[PDB]
Structure formats: structure tokens, C-alpha cells
């Protein structure tokens, strides 16, 4: 494994101070780090180096140097105006998964004056199971969909209170895919100068999606019907007709779409 300078486990500095992270190792190595553009790089022969002439709280974080072809140090920049260094403002994960809220504390001393909250000074839901990690922020293990929210990291030390901006967390019970589509009936000729119905529905885990029915390239105007059933939302566009013409005939399309994509299904209607 490589060698780091200055080194050991945890390095703490006052802001403004200059700091260089040298990775002493054979030939080329590499810095896995929570940083840019607040550090300066220089990967040479004796290894790589990270430098800053002004150590700012934004420099707080964990840096790892690995044998390009295995050594880590964590830097805290003790600044009182800022008790937190936010590595990201939004985190996405899957049900059951671990969720890190990159609220990195900037002063090991604060270790015991930390708390995870929701906005407005509201506590986090009782069903949310989490713990604090000095190097990584507050963490949620086995994240549930209900843990999805916007959280804030606080530190109240004798009247003094320091709170990070919001971290938007989103948990999905499954990876998001375009909504599922059903065209019922799959085909039909119910030629009569009259009666016929065509139902186009779509399914999704969240409400944010639309569904339209089309004849050829023309979108029809059908009212929307919506509901929630097992653990999903359903939306229908039901075409009802009482006496069909020859312009009613053609290829129908049920189209649905959300943030992820569009899903389409085709059916053929004939009337002679």
C-alpha cells in the first residue's frame, strides 16, 4: 500500500492554512477524492500530490490514494462559520439500500452535538433508522421509500446552531422504468355502423406520468380516470363510441410517459 504525507488517520487544520497531500509510492498512483475544484493536482513519478494554499471548509473530506498499477486520510478544516461540508445536495438509492447523506462535519469536536432533521425544525420519521459517521455524514441503512425527503444537518453548541442546506433524498422500490401500458381489446373489428369501446391504461409507481390514446397520428380527447391500487397509480383513457364511421377505423396508440421514458402499444380497429 502507498504512503501518505502528512500522515496518519485524521488531519485537522485552521482555514487559510496551506496543505499538501503527498502520496509516496512507486511510479504512478491515483487520488480517489471528494475534490475538485478546491484542490490542485500533480500526478508525477513519486506519486501524486494534492495542494491548496487556502484550506477551506470545502476541503473537509476523505482522500484515498490507490496503487495505479490502498491508503486513506481524512481532512477536517475547523471553521466555526461552517460546521458542514456538503458533497452533494441530492442522493438517489434503491429500497433496502444504504443511503449516505454527505453531511461531512468539519470539526471532530462537534462529534457529539450532531442531529438529523427534516425541514422546518421537524424531526425525522420514527421509522427512519440512521446513525452518524464523522467521515461520511448521517447514514440511512435499508432505506425505505418513506425515507424519501429533504433533510438538514444541524449542530447546536451552546445556543450556537449550524445547519447545512437541504439534502434531497429519493428512494425507489425498484429502478424507475417507463409506465406499463395496456390496450384493451388488443384488436377489434366490430364493424357495424355502430357500438364500440377501446380502453388504454397505464401503470406507474408515482403519479408523475401521462397517458394519451391516438388514432393514427391524431390524439383523441378523452377524459382521464385515475386511482391508486396496490402500490401503484393507474390512469385510463376510455374511448366510448355509439355509432362508428369509417374515419374511426385505423391504428390506435396508447402512449404513456414519465421522467424515465415513453412506452407505446398499438391496436388495429376495422369497420367495413
Amino acid at each position: 500500500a502507498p504512503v501518505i504525507e502528512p500522515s496518519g488517520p485524521e488531519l485537522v487544520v485552521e482555514p487559510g492554512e496551506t496543505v499538501t497531500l503527498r502520496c509516496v509510492s512507486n511510479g504512478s498512483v491515483e487520488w480517489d477524492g471528494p475534490i475538485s475544484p478546491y484542490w490542485t493536482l500533480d500526478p508525477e513519478s513519486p506519486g501524486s500530490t494534492l495542494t491548496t494554499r487556502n484550506a477551506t471548509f470545502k476541503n473537509t473530506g476523505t482522500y484515498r490514494c490507490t496503487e495505479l498499477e490502498s491508503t486513506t486520510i481524512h481532512l477536517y478544516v475547523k471553521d466555526p462559520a461552517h460546521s458542514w461540508n456538503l458533497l452533494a445536495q441530492e442522493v438517489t438509492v434503491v429500497e433496502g439500500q444504504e443511503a449516505v447523506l454527505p453531511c461531512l462535519i468539519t470539526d471532530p469536536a462537534l462529534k457529539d452535538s450532531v442531529s438529523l432533521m427534516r425541514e422546518g425544525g421537524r424531526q425525522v420519521l420514527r421509522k427512519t433508522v440512521y446513525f452518524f459517521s464523522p467521515w461520511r455524514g448521517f447514514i440511512i441503512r435499508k432505506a425505505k421509500v418513506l425515507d424519501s425527503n429533504t433533510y438538514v444537518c444541524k449542530t447546536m453548541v451552546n445556543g450556537r446552531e449550524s445547519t447545512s442546506t437541504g439534502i434531497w433524498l429519493k428512494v425507489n422500490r425498484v429502478h424507475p422504468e417507463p409506465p406499463q401500458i395496456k390496450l384493451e381489446p388488443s384488436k377489434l373489428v366490430r364493424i357495424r355502423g355502430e357500438a364500440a369501446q377501446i380502453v388504454c391504461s397505464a401503470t406507474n409507481a408515482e403519479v408523475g406520468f401521462n397517458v394519451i390514446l391516438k388514432r393514427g397520428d391524431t390524439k383523441l380527447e378523452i377524459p382521464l380516470n385515475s386511482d391508486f391500487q396496490d402500490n401503484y397509480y393507474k390512469k385510463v383513457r376510455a374511448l366510448s363510441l355509439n355509432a362508428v364511421d369509417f374515419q374511426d377505423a385505423g391504428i390506435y396508440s396508447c402512449v404513456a410517459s414519465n421522467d424515465v421514458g415513453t412506452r407505446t402499444a398499438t391496436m388495429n380497429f376495422q369497420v367495413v
Binding site: 421509522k127 408515482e206 403519479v207 385515475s226 391508486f228 391500487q229
Partner: protein, 148 residues
Amino acid sequence: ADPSEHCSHMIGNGHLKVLQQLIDSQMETSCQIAFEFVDQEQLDDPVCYLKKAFFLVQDIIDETMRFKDNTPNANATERLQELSNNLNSCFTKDYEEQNKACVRTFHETPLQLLEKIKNFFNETKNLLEKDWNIFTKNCNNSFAKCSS
């Protein structure tokens, strides 16, 4: 401006159905449980009542609707907890130092508490169907009237 047209469909009859089944399954009981809610004697405006009730309802769902894991009611309550989270995009925060304004402690029966939760979702649903921007209302004056 955060509410979308999707609010008009966030609460579905299935949520209600499922909640009805929860209710319809509790034993009538000579109880009395404590919980925070709004007293209409202090806040009577329909829209503002609901806007104030929103978090109180969130809280109730979280700390009072306890069922055994994997129970059909447990699921339902979780499905509602989810809904209450999603609904946040539909209520614009208001202003007030007296955060606890218009909020009283109630002592009622578990079935009554559940009725309040039921009325909330029902009224919220009906109004959002009328217009999703509802709840985007400035309820400052209404809360300021609340006393004691």
C-alpha cells in the same frame, strides 16, 4: 410555485378504500388517546384548517398508527405515510413565529382519531380535484387569529 397538476390525483380512492378497511377493522373501544390537532374553535377556514392539519396528520400517521409489520394495515399505513410525503409538493408553507398556533391537544377515541385522518384525506382530495393550486393560499391572517 411548486404544486403541479399531478396533485389532482395524488390521493386516490384506493387510499381511502384502504384506510376505510383499517378503520372498519378496529374494535369499538371505550378509550381516549392523546394527540395534537387543530381546534376548529380557533381556526375555521376550510382551506387553512387543512393546511394546518397536514403535518399534524403526518405526525399522527407516524407516531400513532402502529400495526405489526407485514400486517395489511401496516402496509396501508405505510402507503399513507408515503402519500403524506408526496403531498408536500402541494402545500406552500406559511409564516408564523407561534408555530404551535391553532394547535390543541385532543383526547379522543382511536376511531375518532382515525376519522380525522380520514376527513383530511377526503377533503384534501376533493379540493385538489377542484384545483391543484388550492393550498397555495396565504393563510397568515387566519393563523394570526388563533388565540391562547
